[PDB]
Scaffold this motif. Structure first.
Motif, PDB file in Angstrom:
ATOM      1  N   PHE A  55     -10.134  10.793 -16.547  1.00 31.50           N
ATOM      2  CA  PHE A  55      -9.494  11.576 -15.461  1.00 31.50           C
ATOM      3  C   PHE A  55     -10.537  11.412 -13.691  1.00 31.50           C
ATOM      4  CE2 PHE A  55     -10.181  12.933 -19.790  1.00 31.50           C
ATOM      5  CZ  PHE A  55      -8.425  12.936 -19.982  1.00 31.50           C
ATOM      6  N   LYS A  56     -11.073  11.582 -14.167  1.00 30.96           N
ATOM      7  CA  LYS A  56     -11.902  11.869 -12.601  1.00 30.96           C
ATOM      8  C   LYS A  56     -11.272  10.748 -11.897  1.00 30.96           C
ATOM      9  CE  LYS A  56     -16.917  13.619 -13.429  1.00 30.96           C
ATOM     10  NZ  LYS A  56     -17.436  13.474 -15.127  1.00 30.96           N
ATOM     11  N   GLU A  57     -11.597   9.615 -12.379  1.00 25.75           N
ATOM     12  CA  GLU A  57     -10.688   8.401 -11.174  1.00 25.75           C
ATOM     13  C   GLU A  57      -9.075   9.107 -11.216  1.00 25.75           C
ATOM     14  OE1 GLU A  57     -13.305   8.162 -13.207  1.00 25.75           O
ATOM     15  OE2 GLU A  57     -13.120   6.115 -14.094  1.00 25.75           O
ATOM     16  N   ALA A  58      -8.237   9.530 -11.743  1.00 25.60           N
ATOM     17  CA  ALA A  58      -7.574   9.799 -11.554  1.00 25.60           C
ATOM     18  C   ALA A  58      -7.768  11.307  -9.942  1.00 25.60           C
ATOM     19  CB  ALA A  58      -6.617  10.158 -12.646  1.00 25.60           C
ATOM     20  N   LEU A  59      -8.299  11.569 -10.572  1.00 30.59           N
ATOM     21  CA  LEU A  59      -8.331  13.426  -9.273  1.00 30.59           C
ATOM     22  C   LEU A  59      -8.704  12.399  -8.226  1.00 30.59           C
ATOM     23  CD1 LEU A  59      -8.250  15.817 -10.330  1.00 30.59           C
ATOM     24  CD2 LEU A  59     -10.252  16.409 -10.555  1.00 30.59           C
ATOM     25  N   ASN A  60     -10.008  11.656  -7.975  1.00 29.68           N
ATOM     26  CA  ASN A  60     -10.174  11.208  -7.120  1.00 29.68           C
ATOM     27  C   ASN A  60      -9.314  10.329  -6.021  1.00 29.68           C
ATOM     28  OD1 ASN A  60     -12.371   9.169  -5.323  1.00 29.68           O
ATOM     29  ND2 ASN A  60     -12.658   8.311  -6.116  1.00 29.68           N
ATOM     30  N   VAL A  61      -8.428   8.955  -6.470  1.00 32.20           N
ATOM     31  CA  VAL A  61      -7.028   8.398  -6.301  1.00 32.20           C
ATOM     32  C   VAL A  61      -6.561  10.315  -6.065  1.00 32.20           C
ATOM     33  CG1 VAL A  61      -5.281   7.394  -6.314  1.00 32.20           C
ATOM     34  CG2 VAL A  61      -6.757   6.747  -7.950  1.00 32.20           C
ATOM     35  N   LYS A  72       0.801  -1.037   0.041  1.00 27.39           N
ATOM     36  CA  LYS A  72       0.063  -0.086  -0.205  1.00 27.39           C
ATOM     37  C   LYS A  72       0.632   1.566   0.114  1.00 27.39           C
ATOM     38  CE  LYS A  72      -3.870  -1.516  -0.220  1.00 27.39           C
ATOM     39  NZ  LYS A  72      -2.592  -3.283  -0.405  1.00 27.39           N
ATOM     40  N   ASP A  73       2.185   0.880  -0.220  1.00 28.74           N
ATOM     41  CA  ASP A  73       2.816   2.449   0.597  1.00 28.74           C
ATOM     42  C   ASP A  73       4.101   2.531  -0.493  1.00 28.74           C
ATOM     43  OD1 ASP A  73       1.931   3.631   2.859  1.00 28.74           O
ATOM     44  OD2 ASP A  73       2.523   1.923   4.272  1.00 28.74           O
ATOM     45  N   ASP A  74       3.626   2.591  -1.545  1.00 25.19           N
ATOM     46  CA  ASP A  74       4.897   2.986  -2.468  1.00 25.19           C
ATOM     47  C   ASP A  74       4.418   3.735  -3.787  1.00 25.19           C
ATOM     48  OD1 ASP A  74       6.973   2.685  -4.479  1.00 25.19           O
ATOM     49  OD2 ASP A  74       6.994   0.506  -4.264  1.00 25.19           O
ATOM     50  N   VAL A  75       4.932   5.004  -3.589  1.00 27.46           N
ATOM     51  CA  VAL A  75       5.010   6.372  -4.433  1.00 27.46           C
ATOM     52  C   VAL A  75       4.460   6.622  -5.468  1.00 27.46           C
ATOM     53  CG1 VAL A  75       5.018   7.461  -2.580  1.00 27.46           C
ATOM     54  CG2 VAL A  75       6.607   7.386  -4.613  1.00 27.46           C
ATOM     55  N   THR A  76       5.734   4.984  -6.118  1.00 28.53           N
ATOM     56  CA  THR A  76       5.503   4.616  -7.577  1.00 28.53           C
ATOM     57  C   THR A  76       4.538   4.060  -8.354  1.00 28.53           C
ATOM     58  OG1 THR A  76       8.525   4.612  -7.450  1.00 28.53           O
ATOM     59  CG2 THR A  76       7.083   3.211  -9.275  1.00 28.53           C
ATOM     60  N   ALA A  77       3.751   3.103  -7.444  1.00 30.10           N
ATOM     61  CA  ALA A  77       3.326   2.828  -7.848  1.00 30.10           C
ATOM     62  C   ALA A  77       2.122   2.544  -7.748  1.00 30.10           C
ATOM     63  CB  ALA A  77       2.548   1.300  -6.349  1.00 30.10           C
ATOM     64  N   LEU A  78       1.201   4.400  -7.057  1.00 26.25           N
ATOM     65  CA  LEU A  78       0.208   4.749  -7.018  1.00 26.25           C
ATOM     66  C   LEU A  78       0.197   6.174  -8.622  1.00 26.25           C
ATOM     67  CD1 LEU A  78       1.010   4.950  -4.480  1.00 26.25           C
ATOM     68  CD2 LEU A  78      -1.358   5.305  -3.477  1.00 26.25           C
ATOM     69  N   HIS A  79       1.540   6.259  -8.456  1.00 18.35           N
ATOM     70  CA  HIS A  79       2.000   7.366  -9.962  1.00 18.35           C
ATOM     71  C   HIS A  79       1.365   6.677 -11.047  1.00 18.35           C
ATOM     72  CE1 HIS A  79       3.565  10.296 -12.170  1.00 18.35           C
ATOM     73  NE2 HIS A  79       4.395  11.020 -11.547  1.00 18.35           N
ATOM     74  N   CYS A  80       2.570   5.024 -11.094  1.00 19.43           N
ATOM     75  CA  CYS A  80       1.849   4.275 -12.011  1.00 19.43           C
ATOM     76  C   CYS A  80       0.554   4.806 -12.609  1.00 19.43           C
ATOM     77  CB  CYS A  80       2.271   2.598 -12.513  1.00 19.43           C
ATOM     78  SG  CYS A  80       4.145   3.261 -12.888  1.00 19.43           S
ATOM     79  N   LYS A  81       0.001   4.176 -11.560  1.00 19.40           N
ATOM     80  CA  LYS A  81      -1.488   4.294 -11.389  1.00 19.40           C
ATOM     81  C   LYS A  81      -2.288   5.729 -11.595  1.00 19.40           C
ATOM     82  CE  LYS A  81      -6.055   2.777  -8.934  1.00 19.40           C
ATOM     83  NZ  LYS A  81      -5.880   2.050  -7.981  1.00 19.40           N
ATOM     84  N   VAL A  82      -2.111   6.463 -11.317  1.00 18.70           N
ATOM     85  CA  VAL A  82      -2.875   7.595 -12.012  1.00 18.70           C
ATOM     86  C   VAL A  82      -2.476   7.757 -13.468  1.00 18.70           C
ATOM     87  CG1 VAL A  82      -1.172   8.929 -10.579  1.00 18.70           C
ATOM     88  CG2 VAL A  82      -3.079   9.595 -11.781  1.00 18.70           C
ATOM     89  N   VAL A  83      -0.939   6.941 -13.604  1.00 13.20           N
ATOM     90  CA  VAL A  83      -0.465   7.552 -15.093  1.00 13.20           C
ATOM     91  C   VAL A  83      -1.705   6.785 -16.316  1.00 13.20           C
ATOM     92  CG1 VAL A  83       1.277   7.531 -16.765  1.00 13.20           C
ATOM     93  CG2 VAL A  83       1.791   8.904 -14.369  1.00 13.20           C
ATOM     94  N   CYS A  84      -2.041   5.821 -15.622  1.00  6.53           N
ATOM     95  CA  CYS A  84      -2.875   4.577 -16.718  1.00  6.53           C
ATOM     96  C   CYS A  84      -3.785   5.405 -16.952  1.00  6.53           C
ATOM     97  CB  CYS A  84      -2.153   3.496 -15.739  1.00  6.53           C
ATOM     98  SG  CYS A  84      -0.889   1.684 -16.192  1.00  6.53           S
ATOM     99  N   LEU A  85      -4.622   5.989 -15.552  1.00  5.25           N
ATOM    100  CA  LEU A  85      -5.940   6.256 -15.829  1.00  5.25           C
ATOM    101  C   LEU A  85      -6.373   7.193 -16.434  1.00  5.25           C
ATOM    102  CD1 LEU A  85      -8.488   5.435 -14.058  1.00  5.25           C
ATOM    103  CD2 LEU A  85      -5.974   4.253 -13.150  1.00  5.25           C
ATOM    104  N   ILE A  86      -5.165   8.173 -17.042  1.00  2.00           N
ATOM    105  CA  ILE A  86      -5.047   9.488 -17.160  1.00  2.00           C
ATOM    106  C   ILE A  86      -4.590   8.970 -19.083  1.00  2.00           C
ATOM    107  CG2 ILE A  86      -3.610  10.869 -18.256  1.00  2.00           C
ATOM    108  CD1 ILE A  86      -2.974  12.022 -15.248  1.00  2.00           C
ATOM    109  N   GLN A  87      -4.146   8.105 -18.917  1.00  2.00           N
ATOM    110  CA  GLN A  87      -3.825   7.523 -20.697  1.00  2.00           C
ATOM    111  C   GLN A  87      -5.165   6.771 -20.995  1.00  2.00           C
ATOM    112  OE1 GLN A  87      -1.826   7.909 -22.804  1.00  2.00           O
ATOM    113  NE2 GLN A  87       0.682   7.721 -22.005  1.00  2.00           N
TER     114      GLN A  87
END
Lengths: 436, 56
Positions: free
Chosen positions: A53-59, A34-49
């Protein structure tokens, strides 16, 4: 499965190009840890691509407690900008701890969407001059789009996409003949490209605009109809074509005018078009409501437009037209009078309309008086001609010759020996000859 | 209209009768040019962070 194995698969699939399964394995990593900032960065990047955008904003909003460090400033700002939340994106870019090239380019796009063409132009000049990449032609045509918009609406003197934008800039600058030639060059560049018809549709839409401006109304209408029937995927282009067809039709094709208006107000139109374009659209549909007996909505549009104080399109005239159409135009008299008084810089054309209203049925002397009150355009050959013939109508010869004298004196003070000057002298001389 | 004819000294005796034609009244329509072609290049800048620190 070993964490470096999932990371290697993530890297391979990210360089592959697709992102859905990359997102799936990123969230598998998330459920692993749960505590790897790279993982959530990759998640928001995947959501944006993936366009969510709403899901990444919520995350980002939910995980702001744990993000810290560098923060997802650019991703949050891009999600807001793509969600039309430009106002929040402004401070999201501005509140970032450090400014990166992606943030600067997003800021430039946002500033373009804000119609702040000065700072947008400066920042995009900096982007082009500083950053080198594989899309430098795209940056060039974006800068050309910015300068074309500024020249078209802000009144600022300055590949097929770049040629089309240059044609747009030439249209803004007032040139029309060479705009057709440049658009034909861009049409050739487009035709050699796809052999995707929407990029030719926009070229033809700009071609028909030049055709309409030069008076070739029929060919412009045919071009506009063919572009509409081609059904391009854009929405702002459809609105522009529809309202140009509105201007061509005027009060004749009201049935098609309603269709063009309904295409002019669609989803996302208020964000794709500029504020000046939207205000001109409001002016056009207020005019159409006037020509279609719709008075209340016309007045509502006029009042809403006046609340914004448009730079170029004064809507009070429409309201005056209203009071001229319903024949109780005595109120319109003082309405235009007080509007001219409150706005001296725009009073000239208002008083010019005032004169025409005061020649509609009678009171010609007051019409001449309010014509004289327009000091900015007082010494023009056409207006002095109108004044002379009006004075001769009621045989105010002395007023006509004194108008001649003031015009001649002002022309001598400003532009001596002008061809129009000598025309005025000869006309005054023969008028005095034929009237003593 | 006379608004676009602020030059020369045409007699145009229509100015003294009802059909003065001094300016466009009712006002004329305002066509707008197509918006210039702009590209959302920022979509090209969203990508995974450098994983070299966290690969095998």
């Amino acid at each position: 499965v070993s964490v470096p194995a999932l990371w290697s698969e993530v890297n391979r699939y990210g360089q592959n190009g697709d992102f859905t399964r990359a997102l799936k394995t990123v969230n598998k990593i998330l459920q692993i840890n749960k505590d790897d900032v790279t993982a959530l960065h990759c998640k928001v990047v995947c959501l944006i691509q993936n366009g969510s955008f709403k899901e990444a904003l919520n995350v980002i909003n939910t995980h702001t407690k744990v993000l810290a460090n560098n923060s997802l400033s650019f991703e949050k700002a891009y999600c807001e900008y793509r969600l039309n939340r430009i106002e929040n994106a402004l401070k999201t870019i501005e509140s970032a701890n450090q400014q990166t090239d992606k943030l600067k380019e997003l800021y430039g796009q946002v500033l373009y969407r804000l119609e702040r063409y000065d700072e947008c132009l400066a920042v995009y000049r900096d982007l082009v001059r500083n950053s080198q990449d594989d899309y430098d032609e795209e940056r060039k045509t974006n800068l050309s789009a910015v300068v074309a918009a500024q020249s078209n609406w802000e009144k600022v003197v300055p590949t097929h996409e770049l040629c089309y934008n240059t044609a747009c800039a030439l249209i803004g600058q007032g040139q029309l003949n060479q705009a057709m030639k440049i658009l034909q060059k861009a049409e050739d560049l487009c035709r050699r490209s796809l052999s995707p018809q929407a990029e030719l549709a926009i070229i033809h839409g700009q071609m028909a605009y030049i055709l309409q401006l030069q008076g070739r109304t029929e060919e412009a209408l045919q071009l506009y109809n063919q572009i509409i029937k081609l059904k391009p995927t854009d929405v702002g282009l459809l609105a522009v074509i529809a309202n140009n067809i509105i201007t061509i039709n005027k009060d004749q094709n009201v049935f098609d005018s309603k269709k063009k208006v309904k295409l002019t107000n669609a989803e996302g139109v208020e964000f794709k078009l500029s504020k000046k374009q939207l205000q001109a659209i409001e002016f056009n549909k207020a005019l159409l409501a006037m020509y279609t007996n719709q008075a209340e909505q016309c007045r509502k549009i006029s009042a809403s437009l006046q609340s914004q104080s448009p730079e170029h399109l004064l809507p009070v005239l429409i309201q005056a037209a209203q009071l001229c159409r319903e024949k109780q135009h005595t109120k319109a008299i003082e309405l235009l009078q007080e509007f001219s008084d409150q706005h001296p810089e725009n009073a000239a054309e208002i008083k010019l309309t005032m004169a025409q209203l005061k020649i509609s049925q009678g009171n010609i002397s007051k019409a001449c008086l309010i014509l004289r009150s327009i000091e900015e355009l007082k010494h023009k050959p056409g207006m002095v001609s109108a004044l002379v013939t009006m004075y001769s109508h009621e045989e105010d010869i002395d007023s006509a010759i004194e108008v001649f004298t003031q015009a001649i004196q002002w022309y001598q003070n400003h532009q001596p020996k002008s061809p129009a000057h000598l025309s005025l002298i000869r006309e005054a001389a023969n008028f005095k000859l034929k009237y003593g | 209209p006379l608004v676009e004819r602020f030059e020369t000294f045409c007699l145009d005796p229509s100015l003294v009768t009802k059909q003065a034609n001094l300016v466009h009244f009712p006002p004329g329509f305002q066509p707008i040019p197509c918006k210039p072609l702009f590209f959302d290049l920022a979509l090209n800048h969203v990508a995974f962070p450098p994983l070299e620190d966290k690969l095998e």
